[PDB]
Amino acid sequence: HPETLVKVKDAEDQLGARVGYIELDLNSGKILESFRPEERFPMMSTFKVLLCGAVLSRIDAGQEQLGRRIHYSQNDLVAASPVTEKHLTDGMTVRELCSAAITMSDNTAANLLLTTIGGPKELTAFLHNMGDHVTRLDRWEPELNEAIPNDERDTTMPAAMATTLRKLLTGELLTLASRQQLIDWMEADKVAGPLLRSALPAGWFIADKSGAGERGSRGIIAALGPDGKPSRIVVIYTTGSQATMDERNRQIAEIGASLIKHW
């Protein structure tokens, strides 16, 4: 609905930066609304969904096990890792790591997972081979959040991210069990309350993953819908703003309230 676009433009004025937006029909894969669909934005923690998608793919191919225990150490620890820091003595399983990375944005968990798939280069190879020739991961946590203007490292385009998320959640790329597992981790998201979830009506379904980075970068990817079932994919990214985190959360929350209002 056009009203949502009015809100998106409002956001660019309120934040003094560009906003990337996509509302995709989950069934048809058709774009319902878009704004700067092919401009690059830093993925930030939103890449962790693609990361665990690649992990599930290897598990499907029987090259990885959900219950495989990874024994890491002090050297592997990076900032903002509440879960992995706690389990440093006994380690964590691939399953627990994806849960931490997606539901908690645990940075060390993401790096450990990256290692299991061969690193940023292999994640990008994975994406390119599934039809996404735009999204790219180049660095590990926390450097991938640098958000240097015009730097294309660790970026995606709203449209590419939305189509890729659709392929991961409904395509044949992953087994049904794996698609369910990925969306289940996203539905259990614990750290995106101030965004779309804050405008989600009672009974609605939402599986998401948010991200925050340097230079005002902020974003979220999600599959939501009324009556406990997802029917659309939403992708929102922004970078370059100097507004406060709350102001950025607000703008994203308002865009969501708008798209829901005119659902």
């Binding site: 050297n75 509440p82 627990e96 944005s105």
Partner: protein, 165 residues
């Protein structure tokens, strides 16, 4: 009593009960179970995609278990951060905490994690320090110019840095 803070983190002592931790940190800010098992995780103010936080580990799951581990991120601020890449490169495994501090600056670090695997005994104590350069520390954002130095029984076992110049 507000969200979790550095002052609350400091007031909490090893040997304390779960109830003492909760009353000091403010129950509303804390959680247990699930991803954190027997530990008590307390959130501070929002920061990035998460928050500043503290995690308190206990000797067992009992209600009378004692704090044997204290961990925190973004609750404690370095008193005088002067760490640089040059100083970091001069730090060497085998150094005592004193030697390390004389190398990176007496006010450049904060305690990331402190654990006593043999509590009440202090033997085998592991300690991780988070050190920052002049502008490395950020309570609400992300560390920009920092390092991680970890010890066992007061002796440096390893080091790692990010974006120091």
């Amino acid at each position: 009593a507000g969200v979790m803070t550095g002052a609350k983190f400091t007031q909490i002592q090893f040997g304390m009960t779960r109830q003492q931790v909760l009353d000091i940190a403010g129950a509303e800010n804390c959680e247990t179970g699930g991803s954190f098992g027997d530990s008590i995780h307390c959130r501070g103010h929002a920061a990035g995609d998460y928050y500043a936080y503290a995690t308190f580990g206990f000797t067992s799951a009992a209600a009378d278990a004692k704090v044997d581990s204290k961990s925190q991120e973004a609750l404690l601020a370095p008193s005088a951060p002067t760490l640089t890449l040059a100083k970091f490169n001069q730090v060497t495994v085998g150094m005592t905490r004193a030697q390390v501090l004389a190398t990176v600056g007496q006010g450049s670090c904060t305690t990331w994690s402190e654990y006593y695997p043999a509590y009440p005994s202090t033997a085998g104590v592991t300690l991780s320090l988070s050190c920052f350069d002049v502008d490395g520390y950020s309570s609400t954002g992300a560390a920009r110019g920092s390092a991680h130095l970890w010890f066992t029984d007061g002796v440096l076992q390893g080091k790692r840095q990010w974006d120091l110049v």
